[PDB]
Amino acid sequence: VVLSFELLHAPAT
Amino acid sequence: LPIGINITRFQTLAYYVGYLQPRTFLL
């Protein structure tokens, strides 16, 4: 199991 | 709603449309 973590410009919730 | 991609236009599915300007009110 691989977990990706996105941090684009968004309201991070 | 935290949706917030982008918006430019809209339409509906009797009714009125006004717009909003940057004003200053005393409430």
From Swiss-Prot, chain A:
It comes from the Viruses. Binds to host ACE2. RBD also interacts with the N-linked glycan on 'Asn-90' of ACE2. Cleavage of S generates a polybasic C-terminal sequence on S1 that binds to host Neuropilin-1 (NRP1) and Neuropilin-2 (NRP2) receptors. Interacts with host integrin alpha-5/beta-1 (ITGA5:ITGB1) and with ACE2 in complex with integrin alpha-5/beta-1 (ITGA5:ITGB1). May interact via cytoplasmic c-terminus with M protein. May interact (via N-terminus) with host bilirubin and biliverdin, thereby preventing antibody binding to the SARS-CoV-2 spike NTD via an allosteric mechanism. Attaches the virion to the cell membrane by interacting with host receptor, initiating the infection. The major receptor is host ACE2. When S2/S2' has been cleaved, binding to the receptor triggers direct fusion at the cell membrane. When S2/S2' has not been cleaved, binding to the receptor results in internalization of the virus by endocytosis using host TFRC and GRM2 and leading to fusion of the virion membrane with the host endosomal membrane. Alternatively, may use NRP1/NRP2 and integrin as entry receptors. This is Spike protein S1. The gene is S.
